[PDB]
Amino acid sequence: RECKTESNTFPGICITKPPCRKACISEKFTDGHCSKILRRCLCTKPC
Template identity: 40%
Template sequence: METKVLRFTMFLLFLVLAADVAVKRTEARECWTSSRTFKGLCFSSSNCEAVCFTEGFSGGKCKGVRHKCYCSEICRN
């Protein structure tokens, strides 16, 4: 009797773990666009991020050789 209960418990545990592995997880992609209002060269990502927040974006970062401020948001498609 105990063997049947143990086997049944192990089978249920296997099903739970298999279901978790089978679920496809996705992450939202970030889209980047250059800031419309940031002026000058971008050396401080925190300043860039603050400007991007005022433009309605979710974040910002200094990028590239030209030190431009780029704003980020979740891609729509």
């Protein structure tokens, strides 16, 4: 659970958590945020 994978659904740069949030929800995840490496929506899935 909580596997780190960038949102493939997210069509851009991680500007804000709100858009990233729903991107992870639509996909097979639960949470999402900006990855502290670059600036992509890093979603977490209940793997």
